[PDB]
Enzyme design. Structure first.
Site, PDB file in Angstrom:
ATOM      1  N   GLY B  11     -22.440 -40.681 -27.748  1.00 58.51           N
ATOM      2  CA  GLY B  11     -21.652 -40.070 -26.690  1.00 58.51           C
ATOM      3  C   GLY B  11     -21.938 -38.589 -26.375  1.00 58.51           C
ATOM      4  O   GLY B  11     -21.386 -38.049 -25.410  1.00 58.51           O
ATOM      5  N   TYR B 141     -40.182 -48.366 -25.771  1.00 59.02           N
ATOM      6  CA  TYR B 141     -38.830 -48.259 -25.217  1.00 59.02           C
ATOM      7  C   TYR B 141     -38.540 -49.407 -24.239  1.00 59.02           C
ATOM      8  O   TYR B 141     -37.511 -50.088 -24.353  1.00 59.02           O
ATOM      9  CB  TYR B 141     -38.686 -46.905 -24.507  1.00 59.02           C
ATOM     10  N   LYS B 145     -35.806 -52.494 -24.391  1.00 55.31           N
ATOM     11  CA  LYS B 145     -34.751 -52.663 -23.396  1.00 55.31           C
ATOM     12  C   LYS B 145     -34.814 -54.052 -22.746  1.00 55.31           C
ATOM     13  O   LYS B 145     -33.790 -54.597 -22.335  1.00 55.31           O
ATOM     14  CB  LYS B 145     -34.782 -51.475 -22.431  1.00 55.31           C
TER      15      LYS B 145
HETATM   16  N1  NAD Z   1     -30.599 -40.449 -18.873  1.00 54.04           N
HETATM   17  C1  NAD Z   1     -31.334 -41.304 -18.166  1.00 54.04           C
HETATM   18  O1  NAD Z   1     -31.960 -40.979 -17.167  1.00 54.04           O
HETATM   19  C2  NAD Z   1     -31.346 -42.766 -18.554  1.00 54.04           C
HETATM   20  C3  NAD Z   1     -32.088 -43.656 -17.729  1.00 54.04           C
HETATM   21  C4  NAD Z   1     -32.121 -45.002 -18.036  1.00 54.04           C
HETATM   22  C5  NAD Z   1     -31.372 -45.483 -19.108  1.00 54.04           C
HETATM   23  N2  NAD Z   1     -30.704 -44.627 -19.965  1.00 54.04           N
HETATM   24  C6  NAD Z   1     -30.056 -45.184 -21.176  1.00 54.04           C
HETATM   25  O2  NAD Z   1     -28.734 -44.630 -21.335  1.00 54.04           O
HETATM   26  C7  NAD Z   1     -28.469 -44.435 -22.751  1.00 54.04           C
HETATM   27  C8  NAD Z   1     -28.022 -43.005 -22.983  1.00 54.04           C
HETATM   28  O3  NAD Z   1     -29.111 -42.147 -22.553  1.00 54.04           O
HETATM   29  P1  NAD Z   1     -28.989 -40.548 -22.581  1.00 54.04           P
HETATM   30  O4  NAD Z   1     -29.897 -40.000 -21.519  1.00 54.04           O
HETATM   31  O5  NAD Z   1     -27.584 -40.103 -22.683  1.00 54.04           O
HETATM   32  O6  NAD Z   1     -29.705 -40.302 -24.002  1.00 54.04           O
HETATM   33  P2  NAD Z   1     -29.591 -38.933 -24.847  1.00 54.04           P
HETATM   34  O7  NAD Z   1     -30.859 -38.861 -25.611  1.00 54.04           O
HETATM   35  O8  NAD Z   1     -29.215 -37.791 -23.991  1.00 54.04           O
HETATM   36  O9  NAD Z   1     -28.400 -39.243 -25.825  1.00 54.04           O
HETATM   37  C9  NAD Z   1     -28.577 -40.198 -26.870  1.00 54.04           C
HETATM   38  C10 NAD Z   1     -27.531 -39.860 -27.900  1.00 54.04           C
HETATM   39  O10 NAD Z   1     -27.573 -40.887 -28.915  1.00 54.04           O
HETATM   40  C11 NAD Z   1     -27.359 -40.273 -30.164  1.00 54.04           C
HETATM   41  N3  NAD Z   1     -27.828 -41.139 -31.250  1.00 54.04           N
HETATM   42  C12 NAD Z   1     -29.130 -41.361 -31.657  1.00 54.04           C
HETATM   43  N4  NAD Z   1     -29.195 -42.138 -32.719  1.00 54.04           N
HETATM   44  C13 NAD Z   1     -27.878 -42.480 -33.001  1.00 54.04           C
HETATM   45  C14 NAD Z   1     -27.294 -43.285 -34.010  1.00 54.04           C
HETATM   46  N5  NAD Z   1     -27.978 -43.882 -34.994  1.00 54.04           N
HETATM   47  N6  NAD Z   1     -25.942 -43.430 -33.980  1.00 54.04           N
HETATM   48  C15 NAD Z   1     -25.240 -42.796 -33.027  1.00 54.04           C
HETATM   49  N7  NAD Z   1     -25.678 -41.988 -32.056  1.00 54.04           N
HETATM   50  C16 NAD Z   1     -27.023 -41.872 -32.096  1.00 54.04           C
HETATM   51  C17 NAD Z   1     -28.053 -38.913 -30.083  1.00 54.04           C
HETATM   52  O11 NAD Z   1     -27.615 -38.038 -31.123  1.00 54.04           O
HETATM   53  C18 NAD Z   1     -27.705 -38.509 -28.636  1.00 54.04           C
HETATM   54  O12 NAD Z   1     -26.475 -37.782 -28.551  1.00 54.04           O
HETATM   55  C19 NAD Z   1     -29.738 -44.881 -23.502  1.00 54.04           C
HETATM   56  O13 NAD Z   1     -29.588 -46.248 -23.856  1.00 54.04           O
HETATM   57  C20 NAD Z   1     -30.835 -44.762 -22.438  1.00 54.04           C
HETATM   58  O14 NAD Z   1     -31.898 -45.674 -22.707  1.00 54.04           O
HETATM   59  C21 NAD Z   1     -30.670 -43.254 -19.692  1.00 54.04           C
END
Ligand code: NAD
Ligand code: NAD
Ligand code: K
Ligand code: K
Lengths: 320, 317
Positions: B11, B141, B145
């Site tokens: 989060g 990745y 997914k």
């Molecule tokens: N941001 C984008 O543009 C985007 C695009 C497509 C999909 N997504 C998907 O949305 C989701 C969130 O992406 P985001 O951009 O917020 O990623 P982010 O990297 O900003 O945040 C990921 C978070 O997960 C935490 N994390 C990692 N390992 C963990 C664990 N073992 N237990 C608990 N927390 C853990 C990290 O500490 C970090 O706060 C992911 O599944 C990503 O694939 C994001």
């Protein structure tokens, strides 16, 4: 000649593949491993060239790979359709994680690495007639989900991790050696056994449900030919390969023609039907034919004649 | 009583930060618990509990203690990091997903786990990419997914689990910087324009990508999570905002600031990845089934970003 390690090698494919490779490259060039000890009556029981290995145990897998120094690896263990629906956790643990171990080891020890896929990779959006190599994949089983993973990660290792991973999508494989059981495509072997016994068979697949199937010699011929192919000819990592496509009624007709007497079949839908309906009716294997010269020697009637001759010898059922 | 009790995992990242804030505003702060592997930095916008989602027992304990009705499982290793650390990507993205789905099944939660345009590869049909197409992702990745989408769909179909997902485009936001690498150039370009410094862009000047501004991303996820099971004909939906190239975004920024932005194109790993991804997406199923809509076009996003980044980050106006 290659040094061959097979894992999950005591099962339906591994046993025949072990035998074929020993005959082709010599006994000393093939090591067969499995989770379990060979049963007393097993064709590979008591033979040299057997070692236990649980492929979930990465250190144990690496140890055996470093000991034996194979050049070819056939990673065969997986939980299949029916058992996977009942034990989804086990299916995911084995089909995902052992796959990962095999690939990492083929990478680091530079092995040519075969991990089979399956028509279970496909679902009802695949385009069920003459199903192409590249299509929509929406498998309805956990098995099929894990096998899509296998294909995609294996392909990734080929493209980006310098790993010589090679694979086919097997149809259901028919062999005279197999005892009929509860498998998704086992009705066919049941039919041949019931024909020989002269007993009624209750078939769990719908009477006109077509499946791609493949006779064991053609399957083994294709695997070996793929594993012998030049990298330059392999435009892809995963190929569909096909034998023939038939429905329960068609197989029944082939059997009755050969035996010149009726086979009594009753159609009561079983769990296999829902699985089978979600798979292709037939496969397009033109890419395997073109790229590396895949071919087959058996049509349905020739398989039927062979099965009806082999089963009495191998199992002691009444001969024709 | 009808108010969802929400647990967010992973989060503290780019999506989780804004999702937490949006849900607290919609449903009240007491209804949302956010959790992450790392603890909140000093200047982090963020009702918090430590959770490593790889620890299955700890994940189950928090679920059993808090009793969420909605779970948003956000941790994943994304494209660029995943290429460098494939083992970690596979461990987290496969296994934590499994934990989430098993817990959502047993404890009866509506379970959002996002997918991504990275599920697509060069055979997807790059223009107006459909929901059902060939999937051949070129990154580890993307492979994980596809797994996520397929296993989640399997749980929805056969395991009675209320799994729901979208394929997110590149998400743009002013608050928490991105973790992913690939579509991050858009945010970096805004920062550079405001600092008045030259930007070095790893994506080809004319390489189009599907992108989406955070308020539309969150509005969409929330609306999907509010939808009845009956209107959902599929488990996973493409959602889109707009499609643009680096040079189109450069022009949008320049038009708004009324000054040039210096960009130097140095094509890196991100370009190879981006070129494998769709140019634009078809989201007609999401619009049809549950009423997905968007409010921000590129100009409106540009206007918002250039005004919001200085306020949140203390850059020049
Ligand atoms: N941001 C984008 O543009 C985007 C695009 C497509 C999909 N997504 C998907 O949305 C989701 C969130 O992406 P985001 O951009 O917020 O990623 P982010 O990297 O900003 O945040 C990921 C978070 O997960 C935490 N994390 C990692 N390992 C963990 C664990 N073992 N237990 C608990 N927390 C853990 C990290 O500490 C970090 O706060 C992911 O599944 C990503 O694939 C994001
Ligand atoms: N038989 C078919 O029709 C068919 C069709 C398509 C694909 N395939 C694929 O072919 C491969 C082999 O199929 P099969 O019919 O020979 O299977 P099988 O069930 O007959 O044999 C599998 C073997 O794997 C072993 N095994 C299980 N867990 C293990 C572990 N942890 N470590 C080591 N060994 C372990 C089992 O003991 C068994 O000997 C599988 O990957 C399967 O999905 C087979
Ligand atoms: K079929
Ligand atoms: K693109």
């Amino acid at each position: 000649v290659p040094r061959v390690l097979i894992t999950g090698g005591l099962g339906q494919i591994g046993t025949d593949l072990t035998l074929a490779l020993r005959e082709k490259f010599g006994a000393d060039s093939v090591l067969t491993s499995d989770l379990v000890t060979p049963p007393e009556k097993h064709p590979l029981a008591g033979g040299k060239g057997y070692q236990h290995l649980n492929c979930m145990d990465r250190d144990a897998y690496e140890k055996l790979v470093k000991d034996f120094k194979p050049t070819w690896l056939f990673h065969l263990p997986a939980i299949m359709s029916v058992r996977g629906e009942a034990e989804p956790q086990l299916a995911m643990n084995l089909n995902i994680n052992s796959t990962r171990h095999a690939l990492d080891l083929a990478r680091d020890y530079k092995m040519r690495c075969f991990i089979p896929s399956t028509i279970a990779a496909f679902g009802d959006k695949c385009g069920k007639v003459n199903t192409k190599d590249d299509t929509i994949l929406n498998p309805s089983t956990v098995y099929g989900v894990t096998k899509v993973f296998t294909e995609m990660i294996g392909t990734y290792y080929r493209e980006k991790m310098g790993t010589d991973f090679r694979s086919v999508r097997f149809p259901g494989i028919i062999s005279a050696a197999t005892l009929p059981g509860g498998g998704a495509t086992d009705y066919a072997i049941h039919m041949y056994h019931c024909a020989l016994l002269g007993k009624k068979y209750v078939c769990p697949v719908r009477r006109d449900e077509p499946l791609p199937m493949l006779y064991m010699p053609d399957a083994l011929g294709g695997v070996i030919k793929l594993m012998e192919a030049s990298d330059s000819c392999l435009k892809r990592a995963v190929y569909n390969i096909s034998g023939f496509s038939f429905t329960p009624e068609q197989l029944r007709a082939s059997i009755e023609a050969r035996m010149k007497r009726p086979l009594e079949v009753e159609y009561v839908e079983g769990p296999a039907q829902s699985i089978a309906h979600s798979w292709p009716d037939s496969l397009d294997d033109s890419n395997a034919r073109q790229d590396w010269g895949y071919e087959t020697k058996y049509d349905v009637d020739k398989m039927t004649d062979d099965m009806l001759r082999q089963i009495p010898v191998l199992h002691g059922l009444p001969s024709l």
